[PDB]
Design a protein around this motif. Structure first.
Motif, PDB file in Angstrom:
ATOM      1  N   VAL A 145      40.849  43.295  36.886  1.00 36.53           N
ATOM      2  CA  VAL A 145      41.847  44.088  36.185  1.00 36.53           C
ATOM      3  C   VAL A 145      41.927  43.619  34.740  1.00 36.53           C
ATOM      4  O   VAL A 145      41.992  42.421  34.461  1.00 36.53           O
ATOM      5  CB  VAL A 145      43.232  44.001  36.850  1.00 36.53           C
ATOM      6  N   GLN A 146      41.912  44.585  33.830  1.00 36.49           N
ATOM      7  CA  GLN A 146      41.941  44.319  32.401  1.00 36.49           C
ATOM      8  C   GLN A 146      43.361  44.463  31.866  1.00 36.49           C
ATOM      9  O   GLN A 146      44.200  45.141  32.462  1.00 36.49           O
ATOM     10  CB  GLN A 146      40.992  45.270  31.670  1.00 36.49           C
ATOM     11  N   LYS A 147      43.624  43.838  30.725  1.00 41.18           N
ATOM     12  CA  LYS A 147      44.969  43.804  30.173  1.00 41.18           C
ATOM     13  C   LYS A 147      45.471  45.192  29.783  1.00 41.18           C
ATOM     14  O   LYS A 147      46.677  45.401  29.666  1.00 41.18           O
ATOM     15  CB  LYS A 147      45.008  42.859  28.968  1.00 41.18           C
ATOM     16  N   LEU A 174      41.373  43.638  43.987  1.00 43.08           N
ATOM     17  CA  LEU A 174      41.806  43.612  42.591  1.00 43.08           C
ATOM     18  C   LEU A 174      42.221  42.203  42.187  1.00 43.08           C
ATOM     19  O   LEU A 174      43.098  41.617  42.816  1.00 43.08           O
ATOM     20  CB  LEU A 174      42.971  44.577  42.380  1.00 43.08           C
ATOM     21  N   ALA A 175      41.587  41.663  41.145  1.00 44.46           N
ATOM     22  CA  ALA A 175      41.857  40.292  40.707  1.00 44.46           C
ATOM     23  C   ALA A 175      42.061  40.197  39.201  1.00 44.46           C
ATOM     24  O   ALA A 175      41.370  40.858  38.426  1.00 44.46           O
ATOM     25  CB  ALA A 175      40.726  39.370  41.133  1.00 44.46           C
ATOM     26  N   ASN A 176      43.005  39.348  38.801  1.00 43.48           N
ATOM     27  CA  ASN A 176      43.253  39.075  37.389  1.00 43.48           C
ATOM     28  C   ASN A 176      42.311  37.987  36.878  1.00 43.48           C
ATOM     29  O   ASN A 176      42.737  36.880  36.538  1.00 43.48           O
ATOM     30  CB  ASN A 176      44.707  38.666  37.171  1.00 43.48           C
ATOM     31  N   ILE A 177      41.026  38.321  36.826  1.00 43.75           N
ATOM     32  CA  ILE A 177      39.989  37.367  36.457  1.00 43.75           C
ATOM     33  C   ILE A 177      39.388  37.711  35.100  1.00 43.75           C
ATOM     34  O   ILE A 177      39.046  38.864  34.825  1.00 43.75           O
ATOM     35  CB  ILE A 177      38.881  37.321  37.538  1.00 43.75           C
ATOM     36  N   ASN A 179      36.572  35.842  32.221  1.00 39.18           N
ATOM     37  CA  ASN A 179      35.615  34.773  31.942  1.00 39.18           C
ATOM     38  C   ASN A 179      35.364  33.891  33.163  1.00 39.18           C
ATOM     39  O   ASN A 179      35.114  32.693  33.034  1.00 39.18           O
ATOM     40  CB  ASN A 179      36.101  33.914  30.772  1.00 39.18           C
ATOM     41  N   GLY A 180      35.450  34.487  34.347  1.00 32.63           N
ATOM     42  CA  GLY A 180      35.141  33.789  35.582  1.00 32.63           C
ATOM     43  C   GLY A 180      36.270  32.944  36.146  1.00 32.63           C
ATOM     44  O   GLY A 180      36.047  32.125  37.036  1.00 32.63           O
ATOM     45  N   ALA A 181      37.484  33.138  35.640  1.00 32.36           N
ATOM     46  CA  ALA A 181      38.637  32.389  36.128  1.00 32.36           C
ATOM     47  C   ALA A 181      39.888  33.256  36.162  1.00 32.36           C
ATOM     48  O   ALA A 181      40.007  34.223  35.411  1.00 32.36           O
ATOM     49  CB  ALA A 181      38.873  31.164  35.263  1.00 32.36           C
ATOM     50  N   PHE A 182      40.817  32.902  37.042  1.00 36.39           N
ATOM     51  CA  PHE A 182      42.107  33.575  37.095  1.00 36.39           C
ATOM     52  C   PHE A 182      42.886  33.335  35.807  1.00 36.39           C
ATOM     53  O   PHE A 182      42.929  32.216  35.296  1.00 36.39           O
ATOM     54  CB  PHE A 182      42.915  33.097  38.299  1.00 36.39           C
TER      55      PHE A 182
END
Length: 429
Positions: A145-147, A174-177, A179-182
């Motif tokens: 998910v993008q900002k 759906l994940a708030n990831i 650059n490979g991190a939460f």
């Protein structure tokens, strides 16, 4: 247990002495367990004996009409299952087959497929398609998910088709990831901007209709503690929207053991509130740390017993790893990450480097140490028939909904055998 026969290799065993013991062809044992080492069995290696039911070891006084009364089983069934007359003598110390109870409880099973930044192979997909027989949900990790509320989709490969053909609900992760991190920042942007939330939900629903996703799985982690209430409000908003579209909603939970447990990872997840809103939840009850069991059953129980105190047990799907780890010793923080391996690979390593497999009764997990060709000591923790059965026992004890697997494609034949032995697999399509 009581639904599957699990055997641990002992000193001196051959695949043929095991076959003789259980009166089943060695070929069936080798195929079911996809044995990598049928002529080099490892002490402590565990396998599932592929039959319907389980074995009873004969004692000095035993007979068949008797065992029928001592258990809850038809005597003709026992006799027929063992190819003997009902009035047939029984030799103590030997095993007789007892047919399975007619009643397995239902279970829902979820499989994650890691496709982000990957191109999974035909071989991997073939495996996933086999696994899908045993699943209720499956889907790719992750939609990022993008900002601005847009979605970065992962590769979908053949997962939609695999899901459809196996009567599996296609699941949207759906994940708030970033650059490979939460990212707590991505979390903040979405959870504090209602316009962005509307755009996000539009993209979710549009994507769901395009691909026939039928469960929407929110895996928002490492949210600001400050955004705890905002997350709930968003999930409430999402729930109304998704129910209107006949979409299921599920939510990932950070593993917690108490309501007011603090920390950036945990504060922002209100178990009780999320448990009311979601169709089901998945506490992440599995693990650059030091050598240890990936999902030790004590800590897992603690998280799930807390979850049940906040959330109806029928809504809880427990997380489970299908992988082990190989650590090179000595361990030092900041250094090399442990190597993820399949349980089959773990067995192969014990065989190659000529060590026995140990079992930690406290963690309920197999492990061993070995020395490589540079004389470096390794420590391996993985999973086997025993450890998965212990988790299935816990599902039954706590009356949980089922199990979620990270991650499909990994080679662990006994898992799938044991699902079918222990549960009726729910299909929802």
């Amino acid at each position: 247990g009581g639904f599957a026969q699990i055997y641990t290799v002992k000193a001196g065993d051959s695949i043929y002495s095991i076959a003789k013991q259980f009166r089943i062809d060695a070929g069936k044992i080798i195929r079911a367990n996809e044995l990598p080492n049928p002529n080099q069995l490892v002490i402590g290696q565990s396998m599932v004996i592929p039959i319907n039911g389980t074995y009873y070891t004969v004692k000095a006084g035993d007979t068949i009409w008797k065992v029928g009364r001592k258990l809850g089983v038809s005597y003709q069934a026992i006799a027929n299952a063992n190819n003997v007359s009902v009035t047939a003598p029984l030799t103590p110390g030997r095993r007789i087959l007892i047919p399975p109870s007619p009643n397995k409880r239902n279970g829902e099973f979820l499989g994650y497929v890691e496709t982000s930044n990957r191109k999974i192979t035909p071989q991997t997909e073939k495996m996933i398609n086999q696994n899908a027989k045993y699943l209720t949900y499956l889907g790719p990790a992750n939609f990022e998910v993008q900002k601005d509320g847009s979605l970065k989709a992962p590769p979908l490969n053949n997962l939609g088709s695999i899901a459809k053909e196996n009567d599996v609900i296609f699941l949207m992760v759906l994940a708030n990831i970033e650059n490979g991190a939460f990212s707590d920042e991505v979390g903040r942007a979405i959870l504090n901007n209602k316009d962005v939330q509307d755009t996000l939900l539009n993209n979710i629903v549009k994507t769901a209709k395009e691909q026939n996703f039928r469960d929407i799985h929110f895996d928002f982690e490492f949210l600001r503690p400050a955004d705890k209430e905002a997350y709930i409000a968003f999930l409430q908003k999402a729930k109304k929207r998704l129910q209107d579209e006949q979409l299921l909603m599920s939510v990932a939970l950070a593993p917690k053991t108490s309501r007011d447990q603090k920390g950036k990872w945990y504060e922002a997840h209100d178990y009780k509130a999320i448990g009311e809103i979601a169709n089901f939840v998945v506490p992440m009850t599995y693990e650059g740390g030091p050598p240890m069991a990936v999902s030790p059953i004590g800590p897992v129980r603690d998280v799930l017993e807390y979850a049940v105190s906040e959330i109806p047990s029928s809504k809880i799907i427990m997380g489970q790893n299908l992988y082990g780890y190989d650590w090179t010793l000595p361990y030092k923080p900041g250094g090399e990450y442990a190597k993820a391996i399949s349980p089959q690979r773990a067995i192969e390593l014990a065989a190659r480097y000529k060590v026995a497999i140990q079992y930690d009764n406290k963690a309920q997990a197999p492990f061993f140490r070995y020395k490589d060709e540079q004389q470096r000591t390794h420590e391996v923790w993985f999973e086997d028939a025993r450890s998965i059965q212990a988790k299935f026992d816990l599902i039954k004890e706590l009356k949980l909904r089922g199990m979620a697997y990270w991650k499909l494609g990994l080679d662990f034949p006994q898992n799938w055998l044991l699902i079918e032995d222990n549960f009726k697999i729910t299909k929802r399509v």
